[PDB]
Design a protein around this ligand. Structure first.
Ligand code: HEM
Length: 117
């Protein structure tokens, strides 16, 4: 009963991260930010990061949230879009609203680290 376990553990996270990128890369609000991104790299880092954040194994060796988005001057509407797409991903994968909300509540603490950097 970590959030990572409630979502379904490793095979669930490996399905969810590429589906979340499929939605992000179709969302007019944010897709363009990824134009020059190595999507294999990025899928791996984000899988490691959400796995760590949500109480699974901690193998995240990437940048902190300010460094990751430095120079992007991200705005609130961009962060809302990312949360909406992760929520829609987990809902499409059959996750209940209560578990989506627990996950979102953890991720939402990162907003101040990345906006306006
Ligand atoms: C606010 C809207 C956001 C936008 C537009 C965005 C966009 C990006 C982009 C474009 C990169 C890659 C730069 C590159 O390597 O090509 C990146 C890195 C990353 N972002 Fe975001 N991001 C956002 C929010 C989030 C959130 C909410 C999280 C997780 C909670 C997240 C986690 C990460 C991670 C783990 C990396 C990888 C850092 C590394 O490579 O070491 N981001 N982001």
């Amino acid at each position: 009963q970590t959030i990572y376990e409630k979502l379904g553990g490793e095979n669930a996270m490996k399905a969810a991260v590429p589906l979340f990128y499929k939605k992000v890369l179709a969302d007019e609000r944010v897709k363009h930010f990824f134009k020059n991104t190595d999507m294999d790299h990025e899928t791996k880092q984000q899988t490691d990061f959400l796995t760590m954040l949500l109480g699974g194994p901690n193998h995240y060796k990437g940048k902190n949230m300010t460094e990751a988005h430095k120079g992007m001057n991200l705005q609130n509407l961009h962060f809302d879009a990312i949360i909406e797409n992760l929520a829609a991903t987990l809902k499409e994968l059959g996750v209940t609203d209560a578990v989506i909300n627990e996950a979102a509540k953890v991720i939402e603490h990162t907003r101040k680290d990345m906006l306006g950097k």
